[PDB]
């Protein structure tokens, strides 16, 4: 267990530094715990780990409480524990550094095993120049595996079960991507520390440059190609590309690091051009029987189709969609609802079912939803808060005593997310830890914080993520939460990050697919120009988030709302009359509005403010929108 103790030591090497804040005192603290004390761990804490730490590098009461907690608890479980405890403490946080050290160590150990060095310490630290030279030997591999077919797979649906299918497909694709890397890690005897981060549909990892690891990567790519051709044919694919690098490259010397990842993305594009070999292409071509029926969702005929015009995969997806929202545990097991890469299936189960299945068969992989590897996903659904509301679903949202009963679909995309992942970090601070932390924070806000932001609102999140966000909710709630989210996103990012969204209002009976398509167009309007600005209800209404929140919903809607309620002489009909003049846009209506305002007897400052707003083109669109929002709110 030299590798095991090495990995444990590298993660625990800076445990002493936290004790100091409350290398030697860390080992002394570790000595208190017997399994951690024995063999390599304490020696690594006291002092491959040192070389890995070098490559990585290139109130007391609170600390004391952290130390007490750490003693109370004291490898995957250890890595999950370490991350929660060290996430918000300085070393890049401590976890980030510890994980990166562990990964680098594991890679170095595998490389040294491949080279079969007689004495690692002496070969590395004797001349004292071999430390510098070892940063020049090609020892690491930057590996990227990307899944092709994400959006098409989620939206290759008929509307019949769309709401369900859209939530299930996005979860299935992310869960499948997790399984992939886990399988790869299982093929390398590595841990999650070696995967720097996972993008939705993407996975970046750091691997040893050993011949065994290279052959493992080639075999895994071949097996994944075969499995994806056997299950989804050309609907989904996976491309894996690796690039060799040295310690200096990981240490951002000469600025090559940000280049090298690009080279990996240069190879990935070459894995998607010549995606299929001739034998696979011939196999796709060589159909024998055309088939007598097809699935209404996949539109495939080779696979056996049930009596409900559903293939087994789509039927599984639709069945698993309620479970992913209801049950936290995800179980990669021999028996389960939807197929996974290696002769396994993904079943969503509770804690009792997860324990039953993992003790039943040894090869069961368990993932925990928002809590066994932990996966982060947003499944906020107000309808599930009550049983009858759960039965109603979307219909429960439009059950309003007051306000128009309409569903509001928020489809959103973080602006320049790719620019943020390409040049969002200055070349001065370009490094592995930060690029992993920035992605992890973005994932956490979308997968974890999003549930707290939306808490208390009648909103159901179809899917999350910085790539694409889809929520269906009551319209007044969807707008308010969309504004809350923009303010939170700027705070979370401390600025420099903007989110563009399209908001649409639809009757509950109206089809989800149509809601998704129309709202996609609204999001597109906002995205093409004025990317920070949101588009609400119509193509005509595109507004900056601050404009929508204050210059419309605060400066204009609130006065009008308080005025109408106070006035016994006014009503929706007066507001409709005002709207008709504003909508016509004739110069005479400006004059006719003034006559109506004088007759109306509304407070003078409001009277003048309305008059001024009508004359300004920007204010009038806000005045129209503010009146329309008020009419939707006032209407029973």
């Amino acid at each position: 267990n030299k590798k095991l103790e090495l990995m444990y030591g590298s993660l625990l090497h800076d445990i002493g530094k936290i004790v100091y804040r409350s290398s030697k005192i860390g080992s002394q603290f570790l000595n208190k715990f017997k399994p951690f004390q024995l063999s390599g761990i304490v020696d690594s804490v006291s002092y491959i780990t040192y070389i890995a730490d070098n490559i990585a590098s290139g109130t007391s009461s609170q600390y004391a409480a952290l130390v007490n907690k750490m003693t109370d608890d004291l490898f995957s479980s250890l890595l999950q524990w370490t991350e929660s405890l060290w996430s918000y403490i300085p070393s890049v946080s401590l976890y980030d550094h510890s994980k990166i050290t562990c990964a680098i160590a594991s890679c170095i150990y595998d490389y040294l095993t491949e080279m079969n060095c007689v004495n690692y310490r002496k070969e590395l630290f004797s001349p004292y120049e071999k430390t510098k030279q070892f940063y020049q030997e090609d020892v690491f591999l930057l590996v990227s595996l990307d899944m092709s077919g994400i959006q098409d797979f989620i939206y290759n649906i008929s509307g019949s079960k769309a709401l369900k299918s859209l939530r299930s497909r996005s979860f299935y694709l992310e869960t499948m991507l997790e399984s992939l890397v886990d399988d790869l890690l299982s093929d390398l005897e590595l841990s999650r520390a070696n995967l720097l981060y996972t993008g939705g549909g993407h996975a970046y990892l750091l691997l040893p440059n050993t011949e065994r690891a290279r052959d493992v990567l080639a075999s895994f790519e071949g097996e994944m190609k075969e499995w994806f051709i056997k299950i989804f044919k050309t609907d989904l694919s996976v491309a894996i590309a690796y690039k060799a690098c040295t310690g200096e490259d990981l240490m951002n010397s000469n600025g090559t690091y940000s280049d090298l990842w690009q080279t990996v993305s240069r190879k990935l594009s070459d894995k998607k051009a010549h995606k299929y070999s001739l034998n696979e292409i011939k196999l796709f071509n060589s159909t024998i029987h055309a088939g007598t029926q097809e699935c209404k969702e996949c539109l495939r005929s080779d696979i056996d189709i049930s009596e409900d015009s559903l293939c087994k995969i789509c039927e599984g997806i639709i069945a698993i969609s309620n479970d992913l929202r209801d049950y936290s545990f995800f179980v990669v097991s021999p028996e389960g609802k939807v197929p996974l890469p290696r002769n396994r299936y993904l079943s969503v189960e509770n804690q009792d079912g997860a324990e039953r299945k993992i003790k039943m068969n040894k090869e069961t992989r368990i993932y925990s939803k928002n809590q066994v590897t932990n996966l982060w996903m947003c499944d906020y659904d107000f309808s599930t808060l009550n049983p009858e509301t759960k039965k109603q679903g979307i219909a429960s949202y439009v059950n309003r005593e007051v306000g128009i009963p309409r569903l509001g679909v928020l489809r959103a995309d973080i602006d320049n997310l790719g620019t943020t992942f390409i040049k969002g970090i200055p070349e001065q601070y370009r490094s592995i830890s930060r690029t992993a932390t920035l992605s992890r924070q973005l994932s956490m806000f979308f997968k974890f914080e999003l549930s707290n932001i939306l808490k208390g609102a009648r909103i159901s999140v179809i899917y999350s993520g910085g790539d694409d966000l889809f929520l269906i909710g009551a319209w007044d709630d969807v707008i308010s939460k969309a504004l809350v989210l923009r303010k939170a996103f700027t705070r979370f990012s401390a600025g420099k990050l903007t989110f563009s969204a399209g908001i649409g209002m639809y009757p509950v009976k109206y089809p989800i697919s149509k809601m998704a398509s129309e709202t996609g167009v609204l999001e597109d309007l906002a995205k093409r120009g004025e990317k920070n600005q949101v588009a609400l209800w119509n193509d005509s209404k595109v507004f900056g988030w601050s404009q929508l929140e204050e210059q419309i919903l605060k400066e204009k809607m609130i006065p009008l709302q308080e005025a109408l309620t106070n006035s016994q002489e006014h009503g929706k009909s007066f507001l409709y009359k005002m709207l008709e003049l504003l909508r016509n846009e004739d110069q005479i209506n400006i004059a006719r509005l003034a006559y109506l305002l004088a007759r109306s007897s509304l407070s003078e400052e409001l009277t003048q403010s309305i008059f001024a707003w009508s004359q300004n083109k920007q204010q009038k669109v806000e005045l129209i929108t503010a009146i329309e929002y008020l009419v939707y709110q006032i209407r029973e």
Partner: protein
């Protein structure tokens, strides 16, 4: 095989609402060409209305109906002889409506009075303005030389039934009344003699 072209005009005798948002705004719009925004009559609405009227007259499932308007029945796969295209707001109607600044489509304000509370509920619908003309195009495929005449008679009957009926929309309340003016009936493909054929 022969193809016979029937090019003509549809005159709107009462406002037409083929159909196919903001509060206090028309609640039902009409079908309009996306680039030109002109109102159009879909080639499926005319085909369906003619088929339904011919079914009511004949009776659907009759062989004449299936051969005129196509059928996908098991063992009775028949191509539709009648290929009715979308009718476009005519250039002449555009010129006349542009003079006098007449809008192509007019909003109609209606309401329903409840039998319980006697409370009116307002609706606004868009109807193509009366006096509008659509250039309608029809193609007949001569699958059988011996059934052309009867088919044309059927066509005539349907058109006659349509002239005393309405096109798509709330036509039982005064909407969609139309008139057909058959400009030509010409053979575009083949040597078939279609001079004697008549729709009206």
């Amino acid at each position: 095989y022969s193809k016979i072209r029937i090019v003509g005009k549809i005159d709107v005798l009462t406002g037409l609402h083929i159909g196919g948002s903001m509060i206090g705004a028309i609640a039902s719009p009409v079908v309009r060409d996306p680039y030109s925004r002109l109102p159009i009559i879909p080639g499926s609405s005319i085909k369906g209305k003619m088929r339904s009227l011919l079914a009511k007259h004949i009776g659907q499932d009759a062989p004449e109906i299936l051969r005129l308007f196509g059928s996908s029945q098991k063992g009775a796969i028949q191509s539709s002889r009648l290929q009715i295209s979308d009718a476009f707001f005519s250039k002449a109607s555009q010129e006349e409506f542009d003079k006098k600044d007449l809008a192509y489509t007019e909003t109609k304000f209606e309401n329903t009075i409840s039998r319980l509370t006697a409370v009116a509920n307002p609706r606004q619908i868009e109807r193509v303005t009366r006096g509008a003309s659509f250039d309608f195009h029809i193609i007949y495929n001569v699958e059988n030389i011996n059934e052309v005449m009867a088919d044309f008679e059927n066509i005539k009957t349907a058109i006659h039934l349509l002239e005393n009926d309405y096109l798509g929309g709330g036509g039982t309340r005064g909407n969609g009344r139309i008139r057909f003016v058959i400009d030509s009936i010409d053979t575009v493909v083949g040597d078939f003699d279609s001079s004697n054929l008549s729709i009206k």
